[PDB]
Design a protein around this ligand. Structure first.
Ligand SMILES: NC(=O)c1ccc[n+]([C@@H]2O[C@H](COP(=O)([O-])OP(=O)(O)OC[C@H]3O[C@@H](n4cnc5c(N)ncnc54)[C@H](OP(=O)(O)O)[C@@H]3O)[C@@H](O)[C@H]2O)c1
Ligand SMILES: NC(=O)c1ccc[n+]([C@@H]2O[C@H](COP(=O)([O-])OP(=O)(O)OC[C@H]3O[C@@H](n4cnc5c(N)ncnc54)[C@H](OP(=O)(O)O)[C@@H]3O)[C@@H](O)[C@H]2O)c1
Lengths: 335, 335
């Protein structure tokens, strides 16, 4: 049994990364395209053999309720449009896969969760690293007690951004700067490595507002998290350095991945009561993208809830609001 | 050609690490011993061929003023004793090498600097990493602009401390916990890699007071630094995990060392003109310990000021006070 996906927003991630990976899926297929660019519907429709009946503009999208080949809409647009497209997908009786960050605010996430709940449809956020081999290995080592209690998580995510005119540098479409786009990987990782939610937050922003890229959103905002167990995290979020990594440590040892949450190339090193050494994770059947896609499909088919549901995206937005507040007010924000 | 050292405080660092390294010095020799343990004066005096006239107790130490073979006193005691021995050494007409952390407070550091200034003698703090090949290479890469403007420094220093009864876990003798002992390497590195002094500080402490080790001083205290250029640092200081590293990054690339400030075993990796790769540093004439020792001697011989004088130790204690305050008050402390 395969469930049908409509991909909405035919941009870089949708067309270069997600859509090719349906080939390795076991319970998911590409069934429809939704796009504000007529030329894209033709090109990708013809390339993937999607009939004109299964091609939608943003103005014909609501008619997708009548298409039984579509079970899931995967929203892959600029951040500020996640909420409205998610609401309309739910209104058309479809389950929803929504990219990160879930939405611009906590209230927006709550609205999305409520809309899907009212429609009796499932909602999943695209945290693919939860389906990536090295990340799974790290999470399980922590849970199995290989490190003892988690004491520190040190995680850095950033890339040197370019073109000042792109939507990520537009506050109205992005919702915020590096933290919304890439720093959220540091946050999401601190949360799934500890298996906890933070109770206190520090942050510091560093942005040159005279830079053509950063008139509206932040460049660097680094943050500290304290968790109930006493676990701590130091996190980097940046648009002016390239980094992608974490190390989680306890009294019995540590494990790190660098790059940690990239499309490919993950490399893990561990120190588990002996000398530091490379560590291969347990093999996974399918790549992280195909796994993410099937996870939602399998959840629908078996009546389970996704391991990264709308509530996971909401929990990230909760801390992100606190991070922004801490950097703005120059104080520890309690949660 | 060789200035004479008196080693004061014959503990682990003095006897196992420093004393064997006079072997490779070019301008420094072991001339005297100062100890509160008569047996140690016998053992090491006989081992290093130090005449009985050149052996002192803490009670007879001030007599060293009449020993022309002693030019320098190297204070290697618990932290709370750095100030009184440094002041006595200065009044005995000796130049002073003082181990980190310089002293317990800013005020203590100021008094030490004043004492040595009044005596017309030089003062140097034992930041051996400034004479270590990989560290020198990292600094040079930053100063040469290889990374562009420094944007982030991520640095973690900690070890799993053992015996609860040792002086490092006693507030009266240590002045504080992991930050005083090992976290100061994270701080000092942030300062010498940026070449700057911090203007804002965040911190979070995490300590299990039920642990027999931490009834008096802190286990984890992680901190954030903001510098005038906009450079930032995320720092870990810990007594319950093992880490020793830093990565400094800018828009053009990054360089890291792991382990960074260890006695031996430094390994550097950099991402500059291509993907991350190992990088061997330019060679240094002698090991970091002999080089530190000879640096003070040479400064005295040539009438120059040490690259890590009392003011460098003071500048660290200034940020340490702020870090402790930031953690206690839950706010960004400005400097
Ligand atoms: N999980 C991950 O690893 C990952 C990776 C990259 C991106 N993302 C997320 O995916 C989402 C899209 O990112 P992207 O890199 O694919 O961006 P993108 O290349 O710029 O594509 C965005 C697409 O959204 C559509 N769109 C609808 N309204 C738009 C509007 N006002 N302005 C611009 N585009 C609009 C457009 O497709 P049409 O022409 O068809 O209308 C556009 O091509 C973001 O939320 C991002 O955070 C996630
Ligand atoms: N730069 C570095 O890499 C490095 C490394 C390690 C330590 N250090 C610093 O060096 C200093 C000493 O550290 P350590 O590891 O050598 O400690 P240690 O092994 O315990 O030795 C400390 C010595 O100081 C003397 N001392 C005088 N009064 C004392 C008192 N109340 N309690 C305990 N000892 C007393 C003792 O020598 P006597 O028996 O001769 O009186 C004792 O053996 C510290 O400030 C530390 O931060 C620096």
């Amino acid at each position: 049994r395969k469930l049908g996906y409509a991909i909405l927003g035919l941009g870089y991630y949708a067309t270069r990364i997600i859509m090719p990976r349906f080939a390795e899926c076991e319970h998911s297929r590409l069934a429809a395209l939704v796009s504000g660019t007529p030329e894209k519907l033709k090109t990708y429709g013809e390339q993937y053999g999607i009939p004109e009946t299964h091609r939608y503009s943003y103005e014909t999208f609501d008619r997708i309720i009548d298409n039984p080949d579509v079970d899931i809409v995967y929203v892959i647009t600029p951040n500020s449009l996640h909420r409205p497209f998610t609401e309309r997908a739910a209104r058309a009786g479809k389950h929803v896969m929504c990219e990160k960050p879930m939405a611009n605010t906590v209230a927006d996430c709550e609205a999305m969760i409520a809309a899907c709940k009212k429609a009796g449809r499932k909602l999943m956020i695209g945290y693919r690293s939860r389906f990536q081999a090295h990340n799974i290995e790290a999470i399980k080592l922590v849970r199995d007690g290989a490190l003892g209690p988690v004491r520190t998580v040190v995680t850095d995510h950033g890339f040197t951004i370019g073109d000042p005119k792109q939507w990520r540098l537009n506050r109205a479409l992005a919702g915020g700067g590096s933290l919304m786009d890439i720093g959220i990987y540091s946050l999401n990782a601190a949360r799934y490595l500890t298996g906890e939610e933070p109770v206190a937050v520090n942050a510091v922003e560093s942005t040159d507002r005279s830079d053509p890229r950063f008139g509206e959103v932040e460049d660097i905002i680094n943050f500290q998290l304290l968790f109930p167990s006493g676990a701590t995290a130091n996190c980097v979020s940046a648009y002016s350095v390239n980094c992608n990594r974490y190390r989680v440590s306890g009294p019995k040892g540590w494990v790190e991945i660098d790059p940690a949450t990239s499309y490919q190339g993950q490399a893990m090193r561990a120190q588990l009561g002996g000398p530091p050494a490379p560590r291969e994770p347990a093999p996974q059947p399918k790549n992280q993208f195909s796994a993410q896609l099937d996870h939602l499909s399998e959840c629908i088919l078996t009546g389970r809830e996704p391991i990264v549901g709308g509530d996971d995206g909401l929990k990230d937005l909760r801390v992100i609001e606190a991070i922004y507040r801490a950097a703005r007010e120059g104080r520890t924000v309690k949660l």
